[PDB]
Scaffold this motif. Structure first.
Motif, PDB file in Angstrom:
ATOM      1  N   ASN A   1      16.433  -5.738  38.738  1.00  0.00           N
ATOM      2  CA  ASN A   1      16.530  -5.588  40.188  1.00  0.00           C
ATOM      3  C   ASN A   1      17.963  -5.292  40.620  1.00  0.00           C
ATOM      4  O   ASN A   1      18.919  -5.884  40.103  1.00  0.00           O
ATOM      5  CB  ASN A   1      16.051  -6.864  40.878  1.00  0.00           C
TER       6      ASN A   1
ATOM      7  N   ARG B   1      15.958  -4.253  49.613  1.00  0.00           N
ATOM      8  CA  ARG B   1      14.546  -4.261  49.208  1.00  0.00           C
ATOM      9  C   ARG B   1      13.703  -5.135  50.111  1.00  0.00           C
ATOM     10  O   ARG B   1      12.543  -4.806  50.371  1.00  0.00           O
ATOM     11  CB  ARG B   1      14.344  -4.705  47.762  1.00  0.00           C
ATOM     12  N   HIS B   2      14.264  -6.233  50.619  1.00  0.00           N
ATOM     13  CA  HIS B   2      13.444  -7.114  51.427  1.00  0.00           C
ATOM     14  C   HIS B   2      13.001  -6.457  52.727  1.00  0.00           C
ATOM     15  O   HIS B   2      12.113  -7.002  53.382  1.00  0.00           O
ATOM     16  CB  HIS B   2      14.181  -8.436  51.690  1.00  0.00           C
TER      17      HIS B   2
ATOM     18  N   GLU C   1      12.725   1.821  44.856  1.00  0.00           N
ATOM     19  CA  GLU C   1      13.381   0.524  44.727  1.00  0.00           C
ATOM     20  C   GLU C   1      14.230   0.545  43.459  1.00  0.00           C
ATOM     21  O   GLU C   1      13.688   0.676  42.356  1.00  0.00           O
ATOM     22  CB  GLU C   1      12.361  -0.612  44.665  1.00  0.00           C
TER      23      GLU C   1
ATOM     24  N   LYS D   1      11.348  -3.607  52.635  1.00  0.00           N
ATOM     25  CA  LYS D   1      10.042  -3.132  52.186  1.00  0.00           C
ATOM     26  C   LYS D   1       9.432  -2.086  53.125  1.00  0.00           C
ATOM     27  O   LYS D   1       8.336  -2.286  53.647  1.00  0.00           O
ATOM     28  CB  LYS D   1       9.088  -4.307  52.033  1.00  0.00           C
TER      29      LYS D   1
ATOM     30  N   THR E   1      18.924 -10.242  39.339  1.00  0.00           N
ATOM     31  CA  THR E   1      19.542  -9.121  40.032  1.00  0.00           C
ATOM     32  C   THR E   1      20.960  -8.907  39.509  1.00  0.00           C
ATOM     33  O   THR E   1      21.624  -9.856  39.079  1.00  0.00           O
ATOM     34  CB  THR E   1      19.578  -9.375  41.535  1.00  0.00           C
TER      35      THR E   1
ATOM     36  N   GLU F   1      18.191  -4.779  44.322  1.00  0.00           N
ATOM     37  CA  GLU F   1      18.043  -5.173  45.727  1.00  0.00           C
ATOM     38  C   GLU F   1      18.335  -4.040  46.702  1.00  0.00           C
ATOM     39  O   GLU F   1      18.815  -4.279  47.811  1.00  0.00           O
ATOM     40  CB  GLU F   1      18.899  -6.390  46.068  1.00  0.00           C
TER      41      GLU F   1
ATOM     42  N   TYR G   1       8.884  -6.302  58.161  1.00  0.00           N
ATOM     43  CA  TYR G   1       9.529  -7.472  57.584  1.00  0.00           C
ATOM     44  C   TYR G   1      10.839  -7.849  58.267  1.00  0.00           C
ATOM     45  O   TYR G   1      11.584  -8.666  57.718  1.00  0.00           O
ATOM     46  CB  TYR G   1       9.754  -7.227  56.087  1.00  0.00           C
TER      47      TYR G   1
ATOM     48  N   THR H   1      14.558 -13.646  41.426  1.00  0.00           N
ATOM     49  CA  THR H   1      14.551 -12.331  40.790  1.00  0.00           C
ATOM     50  C   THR H   1      15.890 -12.087  40.106  1.00  0.00           C
ATOM     51  O   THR H   1      16.932 -12.121  40.783  1.00  0.00           O
ATOM     52  CB  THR H   1      14.280 -11.229  41.812  1.00  0.00           C
TER      53      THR H   1
ATOM     54  N   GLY I   1      16.482 -15.394  45.022  1.00  0.00           N
ATOM     55  CA  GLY I   1      15.107 -15.808  45.300  1.00  0.00           C
ATOM     56  C   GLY I   1      14.198 -15.732  44.097  1.00  0.00           C
ATOM     57  O   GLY I   1      13.022 -15.369  44.234  1.00  0.00           O
TER      58      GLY I   1
ATOM     59  N   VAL J   1      22.964  -8.023  51.352  1.00  0.00           N
ATOM     60  CA  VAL J   1      21.585  -8.287  50.952  1.00  0.00           C
ATOM     61  C   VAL J   1      21.237  -9.760  50.956  1.00  0.00           C
ATOM     62  O   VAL J   1      20.128 -10.116  50.577  1.00  0.00           O
ATOM     63  CB  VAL J   1      21.250  -7.684  49.576  1.00  0.00           C
ATOM     64  N   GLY J   2      22.148 -10.632  51.339  1.00  0.00           N
ATOM     65  CA  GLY J   2      21.813 -12.040  51.368  1.00  0.00           C
ATOM     66  C   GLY J   2      23.049 -12.899  51.340  1.00  0.00           C
ATOM     67  O   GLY J   2      24.140 -12.460  50.994  1.00  0.00           O
TER      68      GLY J   2
END
Lengths: 183, 183
Positions: free
Chosen positions: B70, B40-41, B62, B43, B133, B72, B23, B131, B129, B163-164
């Motif tokens: 979540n 987590r993204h 996770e 994976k 969190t 993350e 990923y 979820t 996204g 994480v983003g």
RNA sequence: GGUAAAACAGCCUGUGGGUUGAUCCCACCCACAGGGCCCAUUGGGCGCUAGCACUCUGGUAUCACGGUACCUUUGUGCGCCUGUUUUACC
């Protein structure tokens, strides 16, 4: 992976750095304390760029043999608090031949490059660019520019510093233990 | 440079690695023993590519909080003989605000990158996204992709894992000490 | 014989004792007796020209005093060297 790469990765993580001088970009190897090695043609000035940050040079010795003959190595003492891991134990008294060696390079042209070179034979006299040079080690690998400073290694052994090539052969200056007994 | 930069460089040299999964490419942080942390993204599957070397994954979790929400973060136990430096002492028991932080990233897109971030504020709930969190940390550095996994640091403290982001703001998952009492 | 695996030895000397491939130089073992050296000592540890990683006992520099770098000792995993077994596979 191979025991030489395990050795080589550790050596680069703990003892190597990327250096820019007035004459290009080089891999540089810390021997112990605050003493490191560049190829002679780096010609380091009063300060260098060590990993993109200016560092002053307290002292620079250009190695020649007892007769005055070029050895193609410059030793420089770095104005920094940190001390290098002491790898003098990995240097041999006299020149080393190995059946398989790794040349490790870390510059912006060649990042994280670990080149297997194979047989390293003790070559001796070489006419680098018009300058009689001694204690050369030779290996058979198509070399490029910007590889000068690369650390030639074997498991538990630091053989020398890549200092030049000719298109099919590369040459390292042997890195001998007594170069660093004191200076 | 900064006391924080000295800290971050040390952390990346001794505890970070580059990881590829199915990923994308990620910065990864070793916590202690053989436990590491990814977003987590990432994976991660049964094996990962860790510094271009296949490494088996013995176990992966996770993270969720007591309520099931979540976080993350994926914690993974790596099948490696070598153990990570134990940096759990640099983790806080609860979310940390600092007025000055560095986000460190190490991927081929972002080699040896230390981003000064400024204020880190405790953000809490975020709808990543779609979820729900929690324990998000928020900092304001208009961010780009391939930065997930970057380590958010201050001298002596590891705050979280990037994480983003959103174009203006960046977000780290907070990295709390009790996540690793046993893992 | 290979060829895989396993499994167990490794401080150094002698003093035996065998065995040993063999009757000779060995190689091993079986034991004993000394000499040690290291550590953090009712104790430990001591094959490493092959290292790697963490950890631990202390140091020394430096620091925005939060850390960082190196040295040193303790241990543990992986690796390496010799053997001695054992098991397959050919």
């Amino acid at each position: 992976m191979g025991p030489a790469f395990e050795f080589a990765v550790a050596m680069m993580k703990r003892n190597s750095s990327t250096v820019k001088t007035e004459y290009g970009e080089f891999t540089m190897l810390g021997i112990y304390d605050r003493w490191a090695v560049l190829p002679r043609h780096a010609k380091p000035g009063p300060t260098i760029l060590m990993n993109d940050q200016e560092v002053g040079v307290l002292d620079a010795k250009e190695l020649v043999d007892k007769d005055g003959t070029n050895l193609e190595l410059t030793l420089l003492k770095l104005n920094r608090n940190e001390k290098f891991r002491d790898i003098r134990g990995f240097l041999a008294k006299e020149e080393v031949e190995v059946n398989e060696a790794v040349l490790a390079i870390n510059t912006s042209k060649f990042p994280n490059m670990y080149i297997p070179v194979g047989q390293v034979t003790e070559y001796g006299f070489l006419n680098l660019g018009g300058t009689p040079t001694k204690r050369m080690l030779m290996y058979n690998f198509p070399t490029r520019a910007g590889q000068a400073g690369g650390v030639l290694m074997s498991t538990g052994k630091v053989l020398g510093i890549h200092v030049g090539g000719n298109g099919h052969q590369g040459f390292s200056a042997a890195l001998l233990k007594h170069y660093f007994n004191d200076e």
